[PDB]
Amino acid sequence: GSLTEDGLSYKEKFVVRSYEVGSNKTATVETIANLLQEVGCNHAQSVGFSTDGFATTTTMRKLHLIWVTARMHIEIYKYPAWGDVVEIETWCQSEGRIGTRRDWILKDSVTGEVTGRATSKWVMMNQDTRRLQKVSDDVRDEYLVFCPQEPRLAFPEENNRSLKKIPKLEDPAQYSMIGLKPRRADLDMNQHVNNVTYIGWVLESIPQEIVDTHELQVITLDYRRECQQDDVVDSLTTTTSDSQFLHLLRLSGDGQEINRGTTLWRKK
């Protein structure tokens, strides 16, 4: 991969692998989410930020500050098949004192057609106390020289799906998958649960008949709290409708919320 001509975005190509595809012989949404993370990491390395998933500066590191995902929104028009080459372009933008945004555009390398798009909201947090904080001028100016100055949005449309408020699922849930636990393959280099595992956990409570007859078109996920390595999760889903679902991940014992989200599925 490489930074583009103006140095304000990064592109990379990936060939879809045999173990990365589902029953349709096309990439799963978790494979897509892993590729989004990989290209984000390579963009951070290319300009000198940390390469641990937190994309921090030396100033943030001394203060024990990190960037954490608050929301992920992905829309796929066509999932790439096994052996296909997908090109992904990514860029970031500061969103004032609130935090930052990372956007992505996925294209079929052969046709040049846009096959997907994604956006994510990130907030600054002290890694020890877990307390959020606004972004100061000093940290903001370190990032601004690597971002487009004029707004560039993967989801420009007014009142689009990426910015909608997600309600809390009410008990009883229509469907559930209980007792979900991470294994070492679900952890990152810092022993934290990888963000993509939560997408997988949300999808576990979708009935297999839906997965067999529909394709996932849109997923919006809010991240409220981390699942620790020794935590156990319950995945809950209720149909709200194309088929739409409301989702909730919570700790198996006390019922503490870790994530909430929505999915939109199209009949095959």
Stretch binding its own copies (CB under 8 A), from 34-42, 91-99, 125-133, 155-163: 34-42
Select from its own copies, ligand R60, none the partner in contact with residue 231, using the beta carbon and a kind-dependent cut-off of 5 to 8 Å. Answer: none
Q: Which of these ranges, 18-26, 97-105, 140-148, 236-244, lies near its own copies under the rule CB under 8 A?
A: 18-26
Q: Does 43 bind ligand R60 (CB under 6 A)?
A: yes
Choosing from 92, 227, 247, 259, the catalytic residue is 227
DSSP string, the chain: -EE-TTSS-EEEEEEPPGGGB-TTSBB-HHHHHHHHHHHHHHHHHHHT--SSSS---HHHHHTTEEEEEEEEEEEESSPPBTT-EEEEEEEEEEETTTEEEEEEEEEETTT--EEEEEEEEEEEEETTT--EEPPPHHHHHHHHTTS-SS---SS-STT-GGG---PPPPSSPSEEEEEE---GGGB-TTSSBPHHHHHHHHHTTS-HHHHHHEEEEEEEEEE-SPPPTT--EEEEEEE---EEEEEEEEETTT--EEEEEEEEEEE-
**Residue 21 near its own copies by CB under 8 A:** yes
Q: Which of residues 43-72 bind its own copies (CB under 8 A)?
A: 45, 51, 53
Known catalytic residue: 24? no
User: Out of its own copies, ligand R60, none, which partner does residue 187 contact, by CB within 5 to 8 A per kind?
Assistant: its own copies
Q: Closer to its own copies by CB, 17 or 266: give it.
A: 17
* Smallest gap from residue 150 Cβ to its own copies (A): 29
190 is catalytic: yes
Count residues binding ligand R60 (CB under 6 A).
Answer: 14
The Cα–Cα gap between 52 and 71 comes to: 19
Quickly count: other Cβ atoms within 10 Å of residue 195's Cβ: 21
Instruction: Confirm or reject binding of residue 3 to its own copies (CB under 8 A).
Output: no
Identified catalytic residue from 73, 192, 194, 247: 192
Closer residue to ligand R60 (CB): 142 or 204: 142
The answer to the question of residue 188 lying near its own copies (CB under 8 A) is: yes
Establish if 154 lies at the interface with ligand R60 (CB under 6 A): no
- Quote the least distance from Cβ 127 to ligand R60, whole Å: 14
- Concerning whether 159 is annotated as a catalytic residue, the answer is no
